[PDB]
Design an enzyme around this catalytic site. Structure first.
Site, PDB file in Angstrom:
ATOM      1  N   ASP A 184       0.844  -1.198   0.000  1.00 15.87           N
ATOM      2  CA  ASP A 184       0.000   0.000   0.000  1.00 15.87           C
ATOM      3  C   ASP A 184       0.899   1.277   0.000  1.00 15.87           C
ATOM      4  OD1 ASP A 184       0.763  -0.565   2.733  1.00 15.87           O
ATOM      5  OD2 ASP A 184      -0.853   0.703   3.478  1.00 15.87           O
ATOM      6  N   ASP A 334     -22.766 -39.748  14.471  1.00 14.96           N
ATOM      7  CA  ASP A 334     -23.011 -41.194  14.266  1.00 14.96           C
ATOM      8  C   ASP A 334     -22.826 -41.988  15.601  1.00 14.96           C
ATOM      9  OD1 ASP A 334     -23.382 -43.437  12.060  1.00 14.96           O
ATOM     10  OD2 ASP A 334     -21.598 -44.049  13.168  1.00 14.96           O
ATOM     11  N   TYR A 382     -28.548 -53.049   7.803  1.00 14.58           N
ATOM     12  CA  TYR A 382     -27.076 -53.144   7.767  1.00 14.58           C
ATOM     13  C   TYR A 382     -26.505 -53.499   9.176  1.00 14.58           C
ATOM     14  CZ  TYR A 382     -25.853 -48.909  10.288  1.00 14.58           C
ATOM     15  OH  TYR A 382     -25.591 -48.025  11.304  1.00 14.58           O
ATOM     16  N   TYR A 465     -21.028 -52.133  17.293  1.00 17.33           N
ATOM     17  CA  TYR A 465     -22.380 -52.614  16.935  1.00 17.33           C
ATOM     18  C   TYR A 465     -22.818 -53.907  17.606  1.00 17.33           C
ATOM     19  CZ  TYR A 465     -22.728 -49.342  12.930  1.00 17.33           C
ATOM     20  OH  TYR A 465     -22.813 -48.228  12.146  1.00 17.33           O
ATOM     21  N   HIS A 523     -25.134 -38.323   5.148  1.00 13.75           N
ATOM     22  CA  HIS A 523     -24.616 -38.887   6.392  1.00 13.75           C
ATOM     23  C   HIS A 523     -23.301 -38.286   6.860  1.00 13.75           C
ATOM     24  CE1 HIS A 523     -24.038 -41.583   9.664  1.00 13.75           C
ATOM     25  NE2 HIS A 523     -22.823 -41.919   9.214  1.00 13.75           N
TER      26      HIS A 523
HETATM   27  C1  LIG Z   1     -23.034 -48.162   7.522  1.00 12.00           C
HETATM   28  C2  LIG Z   1     -22.876 -46.757   7.012  1.00 12.00           C
HETATM   29  C3  LIG Z   1     -21.551 -46.231   7.504  1.00 12.00           C
HETATM   30  C4  LIG Z   1     -22.742 -46.906   5.503  1.00 12.00           C
HETATM   31  C5  LIG Z   1     -24.011 -45.826   7.421  1.00 12.00           C
HETATM   32  C6  LIG Z   1     -24.720 -45.071   6.491  1.00 12.00           C
HETATM   33  C7  LIG Z   1     -25.735 -44.213   6.877  1.00 12.00           C
HETATM   34 BR1  LIG Z   1     -26.722 -43.211   5.574  1.00 12.00          BR
HETATM   35  C8  LIG Z   1     -26.031 -44.052   8.214  1.00 12.00           C
HETATM   36  O1  LIG Z   1     -27.041 -43.164   8.570  1.00 12.00           O
HETATM   37  C9  LIG Z   1     -25.360 -44.786   9.180  1.00 12.00           C
HETATM   38  C10 LIG Z   1     -25.736 -44.644  10.634  1.00 12.00           C
HETATM   39  N1  LIG Z   1     -25.024 -45.498  11.582  1.00 12.00           N
HETATM   40  C11 LIG Z   1     -25.599 -45.296  12.928  1.00 12.00           C
HETATM   41  C12 LIG Z   1     -24.700 -45.855  14.041  1.00 12.00           C
HETATM   42  C13 LIG Z   1     -24.987 -45.226  15.408  1.00 12.00           C
HETATM   43  C14 LIG Z   1     -26.403 -45.518  15.773  1.00 12.00           C
HETATM   44  C15 LIG Z   1     -26.753 -46.806  16.166  1.00 12.00           C
HETATM   45  C16 LIG Z   1     -28.081 -47.068  16.478  1.00 12.00           C
HETATM   46  C17 LIG Z   1     -29.057 -46.092  16.410  1.00 12.00           C
HETATM   47  C18 LIG Z   1     -28.679 -44.818  16.018  1.00 12.00           C
HETATM   48  C19 LIG Z   1     -27.363 -44.514  15.693  1.00 12.00           C
HETATM   49  C20 LIG Z   1     -24.370 -45.664   8.757  1.00 12.00           C
END
Ligand SMILES: CC(C)(C)c1cc(Br)c(O)c(CNCCCc2ccccc2)c1
Ligand SMILES: CC(C)(C)c1cc(Br)c(O)c(CNCCCc2ccccc2)c1
Lengths: 546, 546
Positions: A184, A334, A382, A465, A523
């Site tokens: 400047d 998640d 899943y 899980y 997600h």
């Molecule tokens: C399995 C993947 C990773 C592909 C996936 C894809 C989507 Br879209 C999604 O919404 C979730 C959610 N996983 C939830 C795990 C934690 C949780 C467990 C039980 C109840 C609520 C939350 C997982």
């Protein structure tokens, strides 16, 4: 061809400039025009200001010398300085008022993204004022974005001395015709031009950026909104805490202020928070981004029961104990979001505030087995596929690059249907062998996840899980409780498993719950919509967490 | 024989008790005697308080139930509660007023030091009040000193239920006759006695401790003043930052609040601050105890020039940058003290405040070569012995245990004369092969230093001494400066090299300098007089650094 861009600080990367404040003070106090700018430059190369800029003296030593120059100038101009005239007050206000010139920083960031070497070259001082931290903060924020920071008070040279320009070129390892230099001050631009550098005289930023884009051939103006700053893993502070004999937790740490503990989901990493870490630290928080148990550099024992919520939560409390933290705000996504709700229910004294991205809080049903509850919602199929030890491990570990490229995609790029996963015989059975790269991630970012998962694979992550019954029994102990600490629920419009409507009854258990909602977000919240996540979290932290 | 001691929290490890506050409130408000204690216990095993203590409900859910019990009790007693009666206010004040009963904690610490297993067993609640952090802090400070913490609201059982006593024994892995149990509530003592445990009814601490020392046979009363809490290396959070490609710095981190960066001397470790780390964290600071370049888990490149002050200081600034800290208070000892003065002179914006233990600030003499200056003071002869690469390395690395046992001794235990070291041909030439253990250190502590020095040895540490000319040229650039940021100089009466009189002219360059002085203290300040160091540093931090 140009390959280096050099920016001045005052009046270029930071606005408003100091020269403007001396002029502004003269006008506000009705002093003779230029009186303060004259006292400031008094003695030229031999003066007090040059000594300050060369680092011979500090800013606090300079204050009385500037006061004596102002008196000499006023005497010669046959004027009187006001009754309560203070150089300290004037500079404190000016330094505090000076903020980053965001479009100029954005342009530097783009040139660097395009392969330019970037640097800040500045006539500055050694600041020992009681309020020096504000300036230290500004310089910190700015400097991280450049290859070099050259400060006159550290090198003992000042613009417009020819030596500082030769020093600049030596540090850049570039010939002058390869360098754009923005300033400047026309007099400070003159030696760079004399050397053959491209020079831009910055008055208004827009014109300076037009000149800069014309000379570099790179679009810098009218550009799409950039993403927040990300993390380079090798540039972070990495922390490690043993929570029990065979269990150590790793985290990345950045910033100062209230502790904010980030908890990722499945199958992720501390790195899933890459766009949040710098933004939260800049917002005044001490960020602790975890590798959750079973991931990255954290321990991954094989036993299913090491991953039940009760143990994971106990370990996160021990983690706080060993770090000497009485509390942290907990933010989860998640499985990390499920954990943070349980931290709020079982350890409220340790949780400053709680936030979840996508994961709603739904109390356990004591009249239905958790396997029955999972079977009741088709999008949760899943989770049934993940039950049998070794099945999902085989599919997920077969080709890591394919796993992450298939998983990490925006709502409009999906390759995975989550209904009838068990029937289909896997998550990727109808997915390509060589998935395309999602617009959310770079190839390098995918390879970071690939490298992290090479250590422990998917056994520990999948074990999160495999504790449905154990977690259900523990959660039932909390059924008479409410979450009464500060809480935020962030829903994502396009998460087709963790649908926003699943969060609809949360106010029954969390009466004071605050909310956020992200449109066109799948997600992978943090990487899908990082700017919006950062906005929602910072606003909530500043209002509800400190 | 007794081998376990169990303590209650309220009225035993923390005073004053809650039961006392209900009685105190009744009296202050002239309510019928026992009215509030009656409403508190209303419903007995079926009441609101038992539900709270079992973890069925949180403290904030319990408040309106206690309010309804107080109203019922007042109705039956034919009295009125005052106009602005608040259970929330009463408990906030009581919890905030309750502090650790220091002689009771000291007694627990001694029993544990003597091999007892110790535990806290407490009827407590899930605290979700906005002011819950105060209690979280108390529990944190207390719990670290015990093997176990059993909280009624986490186990879903309450004293005096028999089950909680069986749970206690199972966790202690002890038979009842092996356990001493201390409680202020006689009814909660009854089941432990019924099981065959030794029980102590705590009214006044002195009597309870007399009973406890009579039954254990261990002196707990009238004992010598204990040392501050130390660190267990495996229990700390360990951080690692890459400051440049081949250089990584390790640090141990504890606590929250303003960052305090501890910088050790030669030939030491982060562990030299073991007695300061817990005390500073408890005092409200975020402690970062460094392994300085060349030591422990930090990188140790071989080149002499990697250890000049200019580079060491630049790296410490990069360390702050990577952690996202705009400032830290810097506290140094010996070579660490020399570094922190230079951090104050060259990077005042990054230094919140500065403190040195033993090392004075003496400006460089531009008219004398640093080797001439070292030759001028006979006590600095050892620095001439350290010059020649490999000579001192051979002597110091020959027998690590002998090196540290010979070095680390109190003023009255010395084995090393520092005059005529070159003439003698080494530091240990007139020292025993198998030195006795100094009263300042345990054998285990010596072995920690031995293990740390096995990695890199003494080349990097000695290289801190091999940049005299380079450091002198760099320091001369600072001769026109003064240190005007908050500064503390701590002198040690019996350091026969860094004599207190060497600091006598410091106010000429640091006008606002504050001081501390430790009598009967040798060179190893932190471990020689840890209680006094902790007192001086905390007082100065609280007044001058935040
Ligand atoms: C399995 C993947 C990773 C592909 C996936 C894809 C989507 Br879209 C999604 O919404 C979730 C959610 N996983 C939830 C795990 C934690 C949780 C467990 C039980 C109840 C609520 C939350 C997982
Ligand atoms: C060499 C040992 C470790 C035995 C020792 C023993 C005593 Br007693 C002592 O006072 C010092 C001091 N070392 C000072 C190094 C830092 C420094 C260098 C130059 C001037 C001042 C301080 C060192």
């Amino acid at each position: 061809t140009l390959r280096a861009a050099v920016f001045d600080l005052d009046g270029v990367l930071a606005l408003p400039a100091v020269f403007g404040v001396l002029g502004r003070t003269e006008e506000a106090l009705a002093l003779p025009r230029g009186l303060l700018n004259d006292a400031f430059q008094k003695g030229g190369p031999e003066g007090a200001t040059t000594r300050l800029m060369k680092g011979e003296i500090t800013l606090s030593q300079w204050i009385p010398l500037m006061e004596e120059n102002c008196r000499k100038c006023s005497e010669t101009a046959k004027v009187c300085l006001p009754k309560n005239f203070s150089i300290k007050e004037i500079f404190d206000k000016a330094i505090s008022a000076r903020k980053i010139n965001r479009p100029m920083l954005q342009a530097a960031l783009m040139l660097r993204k395009k392969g330019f070497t970037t640097a800040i070259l500045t006539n500055t001082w050694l600041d020992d004022r009681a309020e020096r931290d504000g300036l230290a903060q500004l310089m910190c924020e700015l400097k991280m974005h450049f290859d070099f920071l050259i400060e006159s008070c550290q090198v003992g040279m000042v613009k417009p001395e020819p030596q500082i320009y030769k020093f600049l070129l030596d540090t850049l390892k570039a010939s002058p015709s390869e360098v754009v230099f923005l300033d400047d001050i026309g007099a400070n631009l003159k030696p760079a031009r004399d050397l053959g550098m491209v020079t831009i005289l910055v008055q208004d930023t827009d014109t300076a950026l037009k000149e800069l884009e014309k000379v570099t051939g790179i679009q810098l103006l009218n550009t799409p909104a950039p993403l927040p700053t990300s993390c380079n893993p090798s540039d972070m502070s990495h922390g490690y805490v043993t929570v029990k004999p065979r269990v150590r937790l790793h985290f990345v740490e950045l910033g100062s202020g209230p502790a904010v503990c980030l908890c990722h989901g499945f199958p992720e990493s501390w790195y899933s928070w890459r766009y949040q870490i710098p933004a939260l630290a800049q917002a005044g928080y001490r960020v602790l981004a975890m590798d959750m148990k079973g991931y990255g550099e954290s321990s991954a024992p094989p036993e299913i029961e090491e991953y039940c919520m009760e143990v994971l939560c106990k370990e996160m409390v021990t983690f706080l104990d060993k770090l000497g933290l009485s509390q942290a705000v907990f933010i989860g996504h998640d499985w990390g979001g499920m954990l943070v709700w349980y931290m709020a229910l079982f350890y409220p004294e340790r949780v400053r505030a709680v936030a979840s991205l996508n994961t709603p809080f739904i109390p356990a049903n004591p009249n239905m087995s958790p396997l029955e509850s999972i079977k009741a919602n088709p999008v949760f199929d899943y989770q049934l596929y993940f039950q049998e030890p070794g099945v999902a491990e085989a599919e997920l570990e077969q080709n890591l690059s394919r796993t992450f490229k298939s998983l990490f995609r925006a709502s409009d790029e999906s390759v995975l249907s989550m209904h009838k996963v068990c029937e289909a015989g896997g998550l990727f059975v109808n997915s390509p062998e060589e998935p395309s790269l999602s617009r959310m991630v770079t190839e390098e970012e995918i390879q970071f996840y690939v490298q992290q998962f090479k250590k422990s694979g998917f056994r520990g992550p999948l074990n999160w899980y495999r504790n449905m019954e154990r977690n259900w029994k523990w959660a039932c102990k909390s059924l008479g409780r409410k979450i009464l600490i500060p809480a935020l629920m962030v829903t994502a419009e396009k998460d087709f498993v963790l649908v926003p409507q699943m969060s609809q009854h949360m106010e029954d258990w969390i009466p004071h719950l605050k909310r956020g909602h992200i449109e066109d977000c799948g997600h992978w919240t943090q990487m899908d919509k990082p700017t919006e996540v950062n906005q929602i979290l910072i606003k909530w932290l500043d209002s509800d967490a400190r």
